[PDB]
Structure 1
Amino acid sequence: KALNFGIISTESQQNLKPQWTPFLQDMEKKLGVKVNAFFAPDYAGIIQGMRFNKVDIAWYGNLSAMEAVDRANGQVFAQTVAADGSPGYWSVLIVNKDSPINNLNDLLAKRKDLTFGNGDPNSTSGFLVPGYYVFAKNNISASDFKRTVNAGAETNALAVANKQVDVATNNTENLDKLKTSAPEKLKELKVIWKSPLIPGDPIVWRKNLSETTKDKIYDFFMNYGKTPEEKAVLERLGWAPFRASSDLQLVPIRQLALFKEMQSVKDNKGLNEQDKLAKTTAIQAQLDDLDRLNNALSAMSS
């Protein structure tokens, strides 16, 4: 009963090897079952490895992560945690502290009268994530602000801080940097809207594993880190210890997937509107259900 982990490698074939064997070697111990890897070229070959039992487990990104559930027996069981201390990031919208805005509701209104900072239109956290939760969800637009401007978080946070822009989007990881980059202009910022947590990469195994096997993996992963040795070894892969997870993980990413896809049907050229109505109104279905989940989940305050 040997074991395969999945790790692609942008950190190529030099970089990766000596960061990992350790984590295998403890894995092999506690599990006491030989623990090879699949290095990779991309998640595409990796999911496929799952799809054929040739790989048992793996460090996906929610996107890859989600298609694993989709096509190759995925079950998220754990969320990676940043060695600085977790855990993913929340998208945001930010006014200056001297602003008399505090709600997204405030903002939502005083909008035709204000100037916006929007992220890379190829950025999920600066552009797309807010694009759904903020805009799409309220049937309103980046249009509808006096003037609107696209730029980087760092800029945009600084933009707002220095009252060159009314409101901007951002993430909380940039918000972090600042406490070092410009602590005294982050002190001037004010967050008025948080996305869902957009969380860290998961660990997915294949469901078709065995009661007993999973039990060991699961506990390995849930308990690795409590030791100074253990602790310091996660770090070499930039990690803190792992959060307990589920497929519920990727609800934010699922919504995105299907907001995009929704967006691409409204533009589907050679589709008649009868047959649109159907699909559009079906993807919404899904979002609407997914919305209510987010609520439920956030309503376990608590």
Structure 2
Amino acid sequence: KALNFGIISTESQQNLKPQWTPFLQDMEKKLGVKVNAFFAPDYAGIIQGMRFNKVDIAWYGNLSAMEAVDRANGQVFAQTVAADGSPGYWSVLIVNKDSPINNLNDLLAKRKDLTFGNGDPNSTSGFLVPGYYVFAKNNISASDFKRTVNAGHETNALAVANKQVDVATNNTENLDKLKTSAPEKLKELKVIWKSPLIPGDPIVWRKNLSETTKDKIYDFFMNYGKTPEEKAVLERLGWAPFRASSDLQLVPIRQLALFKEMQSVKDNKGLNEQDKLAKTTAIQAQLDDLDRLNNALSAM
């Protein structure tokens, strides 16, 4: 009967509950069923919950949604939209305002002496996007820093603010939620690198939900936001009304995942040729498929 709604650990539950509870209470009123929040210590807990039918619908990032579609019987059906009109969000590297580091060059030059707060291994902005553009494209490794730990966006931002880690990954959403959870902390941060645009986060359901359940859920998302009270709830989440979506929104993250695999395989001093060819062509086939799909979407 009750629905379980998975919420990724971008922030503490303490900070998430006040944004999410009124939304899930509105969902309950409209679906006529109980809706329970499902949290986990990392993104993998939501994906695994969905794989085992313990999570029915979830808010994911694009990378964790990709893994849920591939591994957890997931399907995207809606996309979040920034309340401020931004067309997606961006990944960043942050250091403290008192750091003499001002750009990626200065960072990489001193990496052996600096501690690094990397993201959740399933985070688009926390892990994959800096993982390709900062590390892979520079032929370096998070292991090349003095010390590295993985943590969620809120933990990383506060550790940099609090001078507990020298640099960390983060994102522009999470930085804006600092204006709420922790404002004098935002003033202690300085962005030294910003990614290309990342698409807005998907909402995903498990494909084995009934037809009538999906229709009710989809109607709820597509129509949410039409009243004053729903507008106020979206505003607190940092969102405008949702957009219809599909697994096609994941293409640029699939591409980025294969690009990282490619830049890795090609920077790999430890394969021969019969075998750097075989692996290169297998990743290339997949990239070609996504390029052709993109060409098709463009020409529609």
Change (3 A) 1:102 1:286: farther
Counterpart Cα distance in 1 of 2:13 and 2:112: 52
**Structure 1 stretches of 4+ moved >6 Å:** 90-197
Change (3 A) 1:27 1:143: closer
Change (3 A) 1:236 1:151: closer
Shift of 1:299: 2.2
Equivalent position SS for 1:58: strand
Deviations 1:276-296 (A, max 9, x none): 211101211211221122122
Counterpart Cα distance in 2 of 1:74 and 1:4: 14
Change (3 A) 1:118 1:291: farther
Counterpart Cα distance in 1 of 2:175 and 2:92: 10
- TM-score w.r.t. length of structure 1: 0.65
Q: Is the 8 A contact 1:73 1:207 kept in 2?
A: yes
Q: Is the 8 A contact 2:160 2:166 kept in 1?
A: yes
288-297 vs 91-100, which moves further: 91-100
Name the larger-Rg structure.
1
Deviations 1:90-121 (A, max 9, x none): 99999999999999999999999999999999
Counterpart Cα distance in 2 of 1:67 and 1:150: 19
- TM-score w.r.t. length of structure 2: 0.66
Equivalent position SS for 1:14: helix
Equivalent position SS for 1:47: helix
Shift of 1:271: 2.2
Q: Is the 8 A contact 2:64 2:122 kept in 1?
A: no
The corresponding residue for 1:215 is 215
Counterpart Cα distance in 1 of 2:183 and 2:26: 40
- The runs of 5 or more residues in structure 2 that have no matched partner are none
Counterpart Cα distance in 2 of 1:274 and 1:243: 46
Shift of 1:67: 0.6
Deviations 1:247-282 (A, max 9, x none): 101100000000100111123343221022111012
Change (3 A) 1:281 1:84: same
Q: Is the 8 A contact 2:89 2:173 kept in 1?
A: yes
Q: Is the 8 A contact 2:76 2:247 kept in 1?
A: yes
Counterpart Cα distance in 1 of 2:202 and 2:193: 25
Change (3 A) 1:14 1:251: same
Query: How many matched pairs?
Result: 300
Counterpart Cα distance in 1 of 2:280 and 2:122: 23
Change (3 A) 1:213 1:272: same
Equivalent position SS for 2:288: helix
- The runs of 5 or more residues in structure 1 that have no matched partner are none
- Quote the RMSD (CA, aligned, Å): 7.7
Counterpart Cα distance in 1 of 2:264 and 2:18: 43
